[PDB]
Design a protein around this motif. Structure first.
Motif, PDB file in Angstrom:
ATOM      1  N   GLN A  64      -5.006  86.713  16.515  1.00  0.00           N
ATOM      2  CA  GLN A  64      -3.910  85.817  16.821  1.00  0.00           C
ATOM      3  C   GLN A  64      -3.427  85.957  18.248  1.00  0.00           C
ATOM      4  O   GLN A  64      -2.357  85.462  18.594  1.00  0.00           O
ATOM      5  CB  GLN A  64      -2.776  86.029  15.823  1.00  0.00           C
ATOM      6  N   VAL A  65      -4.214  86.605  19.094  1.00  0.00           N
ATOM      7  CA  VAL A  65      -3.902  86.670  20.506  1.00  0.00           C
ATOM      8  C   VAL A  65      -4.141  85.332  21.183  1.00  0.00           C
ATOM      9  O   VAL A  65      -3.594  85.071  22.256  1.00  0.00           O
ATOM     10  CB  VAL A  65      -4.728  87.791  21.132  1.00  0.00           C
ATOM     11  N   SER A  66      -4.919  84.458  20.559  1.00  0.00           N
ATOM     12  CA  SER A  66      -5.146  83.136  21.098  1.00  0.00           C
ATOM     13  C   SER A  66      -3.918  82.263  21.000  1.00  0.00           C
ATOM     14  O   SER A  66      -3.831  81.263  21.705  1.00  0.00           O
ATOM     15  CB  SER A  66      -6.307  82.482  20.373  1.00  0.00           C
ATOM     16  N   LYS A  67      -2.975  82.613  20.140  1.00  0.00           N
ATOM     17  CA  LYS A  67      -1.739  81.878  19.984  1.00  0.00           C
ATOM     18  C   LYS A  67      -0.569  82.543  20.665  1.00  0.00           C
ATOM     19  O   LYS A  67       0.109  81.920  21.478  1.00  0.00           O
ATOM     20  CB  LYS A  67      -1.432  81.705  18.499  1.00  0.00           C
ATOM     21  N   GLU A  68      -0.342  83.814  20.373  1.00  0.00           N
ATOM     22  CA  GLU A  68       0.886  84.483  20.751  1.00  0.00           C
ATOM     23  C   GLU A  68       0.977  84.737  22.243  1.00  0.00           C
ATOM     24  O   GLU A  68       2.083  84.774  22.783  1.00  0.00           O
ATOM     25  CB  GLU A  68       0.996  85.785  19.976  1.00  0.00           C
ATOM     26  N   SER A  69      -0.156  84.881  22.924  1.00  0.00           N
ATOM     27  CA  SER A  69      -0.133  85.117  24.354  1.00  0.00           C
ATOM     28  C   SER A  69       0.279  83.892  25.141  1.00  0.00           C
ATOM     29  O   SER A  69       0.695  84.007  26.289  1.00  0.00           O
ATOM     30  CB  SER A  69      -1.493  85.591  24.833  1.00  0.00           C
ATOM     31  N   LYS A  70       0.151  82.721  24.556  1.00  0.00           N
ATOM     32  CA  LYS A  70       0.727  81.522  25.117  1.00  0.00           C
ATOM     33  C   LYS A  70       2.030  81.154  24.437  1.00  0.00           C
ATOM     34  O   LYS A  70       2.501  80.034  24.584  1.00  0.00           O
ATOM     35  CB  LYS A  70      -0.268  80.377  25.052  1.00  0.00           C
ATOM     36  N   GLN A  71       2.615  82.078  23.689  1.00  0.00           N
ATOM     37  CA  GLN A  71       3.924  81.899  23.091  1.00  0.00           C
ATOM     38  C   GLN A  71       4.977  82.751  23.768  1.00  0.00           C
ATOM     39  O   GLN A  71       6.015  82.244  24.187  1.00  0.00           O
ATOM     40  CB  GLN A  71       3.863  82.209  21.598  1.00  0.00           C
ATOM     41  N   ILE A  72       4.724  84.041  23.883  1.00  0.00           N
ATOM     42  CA  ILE A  72       5.695  84.917  24.507  1.00  0.00           C
ATOM     43  C   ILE A  72       5.720  84.686  26.005  1.00  0.00           C
ATOM     44  O   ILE A  72       6.773  84.801  26.636  1.00  0.00           O
ATOM     45  CB  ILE A  72       5.390  86.365  24.125  1.00  0.00           C
ATOM     46  N   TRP A  73       4.584  84.307  26.588  1.00  0.00           N
ATOM     47  CA  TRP A  73       4.548  83.942  27.996  1.00  0.00           C
ATOM     48  C   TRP A  73       5.411  82.739  28.293  1.00  0.00           C
ATOM     49  O   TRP A  73       6.064  82.672  29.331  1.00  0.00           O
ATOM     50  CB  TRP A  73       3.122  83.666  28.427  1.00  0.00           C
TER      51      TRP A  73
END
Lengths: 451, 148, 55
Positions: free
Chosen positions: A394-403
């Motif tokens: 799920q790094v494909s989602k969350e890294s463009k979320q918290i950023w």
């Protein structure tokens, strides 16, 4: 609403002080069907509220917590009622002065929409919509909720006005903290017996610099360990926060060593001086706005290496304090200094020991040292597994979320930093006199349809 | 790098240039082993990786050597009595040996200040160990999302 | 796939091993479900739903 015996007051609150709109927000489950009709009722009531009462708007009435329905939808993590209040354009032409979306000019392919910044950026008011999006809402949907139309451009407004300015101050304010520390180091009297009589006025001047340098390292030390229990790579990447921490560790170690009475403080003091000018090499990147995947990684890198150091040092202290307790005859109080000195050297591999003779008990010293490797080798692999067990699912989602979240989080913290006088200066949005005048925001569009 | 180091050493006057000069000669004939691949036209994923490998190891060397020069130049400034101009050669020689672990030092006696030498050396490991992990995180933070 | 499979499996695996640990006396104490007299009474379990369709 319309009747003959007695009507129903739309403005009536409850024991919670909520009107009819707030209940619609509270039941607004973000589904397919439920986001449909709530937008139908929300348009129906406000027009009916204006037609029966032209003076007051139904959105104006607050709660026991002074919350509008737009203010409430950010709290409970609602999206469908949120995106409809923002995209509010009413055809009824009597409830027009409360409409939110406008059409400025339509020169062919280019549409000029217009969103009001009525509660989005409250300049001199109590609390904003955008503040609750960041500071108060703990709902998962806040990543999607910031991806609504005006806020994606509203955050880019104040980033372009305040990002380059606040970053350049951060570069200079770090350089101020370095030039102070250079004047401390090169102007030491350097006799060999620390500390010093602080009576000379020209030595009292550099005495003040120790207040500046040390306490800055203290604040950075105690806040981050509190933030651990309770990586802003926008300005400076997350590798700096670990390195500036190591700068912060060496300062407070330095402050002890000339208060103990040992004059070898001078090595460590100039050591951190070399890093601090070389920590300035992270200032040359500029400013980053595109999110990589390593940003979430470097928090856990900082999270566990700080745990890796404390699990080291407590183990080294604990095993040294253990071996003193084996000494039943008197032992000496200076042995613990000699246990701990001879214990650090083994992990490096100096072999310059003073007490522990490996020739005395070889079959025990090896099997403790072999198991010491195995303890340390697994804790190194706990770093790599925690990274490999992160960069997959799920790094494909969350890294463009918290950023996206942290980009919005920091710019409001910059906004809180300015006073009320400078707040009104670089305020986005313009006065556009519409109706029978407000601080709205201009948004461009391009569309080839709608002919 | 080894060629321009070689060109200095016989202009200084030190005749031990001959070791480094033939050293790079061994690599240059062994660098020819990359010629045997032929020609590559199908793109792998490691190609973008090896730019950042080259990007940061060159940064890793300069952050090393400037730190070694800087900490050596630091310790000369501690010497208020006269010190000698040949001490900086002896600080820097005794400082490279610690990172390798030769233990063939000339000035720094670890028996003199043991409680300070360790806690600088332990923190030197921690500085270097994180900069190694900055390589791996920059690679792991690359081969996931948009490398496809 | 599998990391959200065995994690669901092991979460179910352990809680039944906890269930085997208690005696028969404490087993009846924290028993889920309620007696709801339906028909012409059983130990059923209450489940909530939310639906905007079916009108």
């Amino acid at each position: 609403t319309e009747n003959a015996h007695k009507k129903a007051d739309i403005r009536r609150q409850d024991s919670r002080g909520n009107t009819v709109l707030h209940a619609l927000v509270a039941i607004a489950d973000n589904t397919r069907e439920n986001t449909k009709f709530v937008t139908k009722v929300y348009d129906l009531l406000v027009i009916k509220c204006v037609k029966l009462y032209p003076d007051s708007s139904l959105e104006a009435i607050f709660n026991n917590d002074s919350m509008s329905p737009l203010m409430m939808a950010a709290k409970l993590g609602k999206i469908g009622i949120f995106q409809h209040i923002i995209r509010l354009e009413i055809k009824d032409e009597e409830a027009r002065h409360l409409s939110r979306k406008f059409r400025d000019w339509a020169y062919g392919p280019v549409y000029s929409s217009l969103y009001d910044l009525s509660m989005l950026d409250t300049c001199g008011e109590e609390v904003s919509v955008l503040e609750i999006l960041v500071y108060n809402s703990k709902v998962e949907n806040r990543h999607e909720m910031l991806a609504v139309e005006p806020i994606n451009e509203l955050l880019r407004d104040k980033w372009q006005k305040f990002g380059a300015v606040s970053f350049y101050i951060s570069v200079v304010s770090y350089l101020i903290a370095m030039i102070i520390f250079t004047l401390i180091a090169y102007y030491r009297p350097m006799d060999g017996t620390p500390p010093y009589p602080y009576r000379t006025t020209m030595d009292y001047m550099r005495l003040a610099g120790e207040i500046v340098t040390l306490l800055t390292g203290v604040v950075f030390f105690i806040t981050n360990i509190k933030d651990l229990f309770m990586v802003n790579s926008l300005f400076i990447d997350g590798s700096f926060q670990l390195l500036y921490f190591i700068y912060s560790v060496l300062v407070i170690i330095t402050a002890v060593l000339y208060l103990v009475g040992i004059e070898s403080y001078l090595a460590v003091m100039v050591f951190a001086l070399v890093l601090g000018w070389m920590n300035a090499l992270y200032f040359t990147r500029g400013l980053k706005l595109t999110g990589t995947y390593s940003i979430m990684l470097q928090k856990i890198l900082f999270k566990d290496l700080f745990r890796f150091l404390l699990v080291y040092l407590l183990f080294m202290i604990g095993y040294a304090s253990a071996l003193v307790s084996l000494l039943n005859p008197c032992r000496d109080s200076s042995t613990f200094s000699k246990f701990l000195l001879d214990l650090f050297k083994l992990t490096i591999g100096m072999g310059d020991l003073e007490m522990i003779n490996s020739a005395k008990y070889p079959a025990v010293f090896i099997i403790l040292l072999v198991t010491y490797i195995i303890l340390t080798f697994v804790l190194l692999l706990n770093m790599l597994i925690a990274l490999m067990g992160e960069t997959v699912g799920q790094v494909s989602k969350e890294s463009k979320q918290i950023w996206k979240l942290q980009w919005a989080t920091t710019i409001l913290d910059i906004e809180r930093s300015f006073p009320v006088c400078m707040r009104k200066a670089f305020r986005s949005g313009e006065m556009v006199t519409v109706g029978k005048r407000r601080w709205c925001f201009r948004v461009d569009e391009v569309n080839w349809s709608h002919w």
